[PDB]
From a paper:
To explore the structural basis for reduced SERM potency and efficacy, the [name] mutant ERα LBD was co-crystallized with TOT. However, the [name]-TOT structure was solved to 3.06 Å with four dimers in the ASU by molecular replacement. The TOT ligand and H12 are both well resolved in every monomer. As with the WT-TOT structure, H12 of the [name]-TOT structure lies in the AF-2 cleft; the conformation of H12 in the mutant structure, however, is altered compared to the WT. In [name]-TOT, L536 is oriented toward solvent rather than docking into the well-defined leucine-binding pocket found in the WT-TOT structure, and P535 occupies the space previously occupied by the L536 of the WT. The largest conformational change occurs in the H11-12 loop (residues 527–537). Instead of extruding toward solvent, the loop is packed toward the interior of the protein by 9.6 Å compared to the WT (V534 alphacarbon to alpha carbon). This conformational change likely explains why trypsin displayed a reduced ability to cleave at this region. Additionally, the tertiary amine at the terminus of the TOT ligand is observed in several conformations in the complex with [name] ER rather than the single conformation present in the WT-TOT structure. Together, these observations suggest that the flexibility of a glycine at position 538 reduces the ability of an antagonist to influence the H11-12 loop and H12.
The [name] α (ERα) is a ligand-activated nuclear hormone receptor and a major regulator of cell growth, survival, and metastasis in a large fraction of breast cancers. Structurally, ERα LBD is an α-helical bundle, with the C-terminal helix, H12, functioning as a key structural component of the activating function-2 (AF-2) cleft that governs the agonist or antagonist state of the receptor. The [name] and [name] mutations are especially interesting because they occur at the N-terminus of Helix 12 (H12) in the ERα ligand-binding domain (LBD). Importantly, breast cancer cell-based studies revealed that the [name] and [name] mutations conferred hormone-independent activation of ERα and reduced the inhibitory potency and efficacy of clinically prescribed SERMs and SERDs.
Numbering used by the authors:
A (entry chain A): 307 to 329, 342 to 399, 401 to 416, 420 to 459, 468 to 527, 533 to 545
B (entry chain F): 307 to 331, 336 to 458, 460 to 461, 468 to 527, 536 to 545
């Protein structure tokens, strides 16, 4: 549950991973939408999430879905200085031409991950963080959510330790990772805003959440 | 000033805080935005001078000083608001003479939701017994991290200062009796409350839509 050990955590999280998908606003809309159905399923497989209410499971996915899509998108693009929406569709920044500076922001985060040589294990933890931490703001599990988040913080450190960083680089990397989550909230917001020139609604979320 | 001990780094930052401002005022209407605009802009002038007092910040080039500040100001004001509101459950302390309960924010369409969010964050800081040293750390962390979407071997610099704060932030926690885990854990918690604040800051902007020249010359 949370009495998972940090290796059991990473084990779970890598196994939770949604498949790889293949295929203009229509392109990316249809694409997001599709990925959005798998995301619902991964959320379920995330340790600690299945513990919350439906009403709360749903709130959380309500609040995080777009950054979960972006940080994903940012991830698979690390190795293509180019956004690789799916193996078969891979756009450059010129191609963004009112969506250009969202792309610019994304390609920033993408290089910053390449620079940081981010790990699939580290990545995978960041995503669970975004799921739980996003909407965490009358007897409560916010307490619970907070516990699961601390588990993951420990899981993150634990990975860095295993990999043989010094205790100082551990707190340091953890920082520059959790800070990129800020950048990502932002691009997500700029995203939401531009999809008023939208949010997967409740009942549907809730019925698939089961 | 890259190398200077955690102790130094804290007092530097603690000793550079803008003054405490007072507001001016015939009971509230949507003339309250004007009221809050005003407070914003005065505060924003002093924030320029605090940016300059933050170690490493003047080392950056003028345009980057501006990029950073342009990108992080409302986020920097909100965290300040939040911070000073911590000792006053249920109300936002705009100025020492302008405590405002959430009810009052409902007198400007779309603001109550921001207010709610702020009061939540203010809660969370109190419940964490966030110390002033840690707050000062996070303010500077917002200045630095928010803009860091830009030769640019200046990013590298920004980053190393940022690590330097991290150290300083850890260092305090260490010195308050905190076991190693509890350190890594609280550090997470604070940096993760930084996301919450950008969110608020963006929400702020949108309902402030529905500047450069000034900051450049003002930053000399
Ligand atoms: C930047 C990529 C993107 C989308 C996207 C991101 C990652 C990914 O893996 C796939 C797509 C995007 C576009 C539309 C969108 O809304 C769909 C509405 N559905 C939920 C009914 C979501 C993401 C987008 C978002 C806002 C504006 C312009 C583009
Ligand atoms: C929530 C507080 C707030 C402002 C504020 C926050 C903290 C603080 O210490 C002082 C004020 C606020 C209001 C207006 C504003 O605009 C300034 C425009 N200038 C920069 C051109 C900035 C902040 C606000 C922001 C957006 C919409 C409604 C209210």
């Amino acid at each position: 549950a949370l009495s998972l050990t940090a290796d059991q955590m990473v084990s779970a999280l890598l196994d939770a991973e949604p498949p790889i998908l293949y295929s203009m606003m229509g392109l990316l809309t249809n694409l997001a939408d599709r990925e959005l159905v798998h995301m619902i399923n991964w959320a379920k497989r995330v340790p600690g999430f299945v513990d919350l209410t439906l009403h709360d499971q749903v709130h959380l996915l309500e609040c995080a879905w777009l950054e979960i899509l972006m940080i994903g998108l940012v991830w698979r693009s690390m190795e293509h200085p180019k956004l690789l929406f799916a193996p078969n569709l891979l756009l450059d920044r010129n191609q963004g031409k009112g969506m250009v500076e969202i792309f610019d922001m994304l390609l920033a985060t993408s290089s910053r991950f390449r620079m940081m040589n981010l790990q699939g294990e580290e990545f995978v933890c960041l995503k669970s963080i975004i799921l739980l931490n996003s909407g965490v703001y009358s007897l409560e599990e916010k307490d619970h959510i907070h516990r699961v988040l601390d588990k993951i913080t420990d899981t993150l450190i634990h990975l860095m330790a295993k990999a043989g960083l010094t205790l100082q680089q551990q707190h340091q990397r953890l920082a520059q990772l959790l800070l990129i989550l800020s950048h990502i909230r932002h691009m997500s917001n700029k995203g939401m805003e531009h999809l008023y020139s939208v949010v997967p609604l409740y009942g549907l979320l809730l019925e698939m959440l089961d």
